[PDB]
Design a protein around this ligand. Structure first.
Ligand SMILES: CC(F)(F)c1nnc(N[C@H](c2cn3ncc([C@@H](C4CC4)N4C[C@@H](C(F)(F)F)NC4=O)cc3n2)C2CCC(F)(F)CC2)o1
Lengths: 98, 99
């Protein structure tokens, strides 16, 4: 264990609507985790929006997955003690050539 | 102060075909945890078309997200931190510019 003290008191999105692989945000909630709420990107379409403004299936919208560190309550249900943990979160969508 | 204890011992390529591909840039700060953060930098100003050529009628833009980091408090402290928000680039997407 490398135990440290953390003080939790801390001292654009509408532009991504113009993406050829647009996404919406999905609420992910876990009361055993900090941050408990994580907004996860879900691609709106299987294809990408082409020059005509239409969904084109010759290209694919794919979620960008990132490794994210979160705090897991340790022991479970502990309000003040945690262990660092890695999870995968979707942070947006990009358009790929299959 | 909302002081909590954190155990820092972690429990636990595809996007190359993107029309708005990106590379990773090393962001290092010895006063922060994680000290090293890899940020996405868009490879091109435009988006890659069907022919494999850059088209400047569209733009590759970095997706900026707010993430939480630990700042050493007091400075240089090996075991005490304050939570802090920073803005990082987590990938690139292709956008149709405003006309
Ligand atoms: C909104 C949220 F997703 F819940 C969220 N916000 N911050 C976190 N987690 C915070 C957080 C910060 N980072 N910074 C870097 C990384 C690494 C991944 C290889 C491990 N990445 C991911 C990628 C990107 F950051 F650019 F995305 N590039 C990287 O180098 C993960 C990460 N996790 C977390 C909150 C608890 C804490 F303070 F104790 C510690 C830090 O989650």
């Amino acid at each position: 264990p490398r135990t440290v003290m953390v003080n939790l008191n801390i001292h654009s999105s509408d532009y991504y609507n113009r993406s050829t692989s647009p996404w919406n945000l999905h609420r992910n909630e876990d009361p055993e985790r900090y941050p408990s709420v994580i907004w996860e990107a879900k691609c709106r379409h299987l294809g990408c929006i082409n020059a005509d403004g239409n969904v084109d299936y010759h290209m694919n919208s794919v979620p960008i997955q990132q490794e994210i560190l979160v705090l897991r309550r340790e022991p479970p249900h502990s309000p003040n003690s945690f262990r660092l943990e890695k999870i995968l979160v979707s942070v947006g969508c990009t358009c790929v050539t299959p």
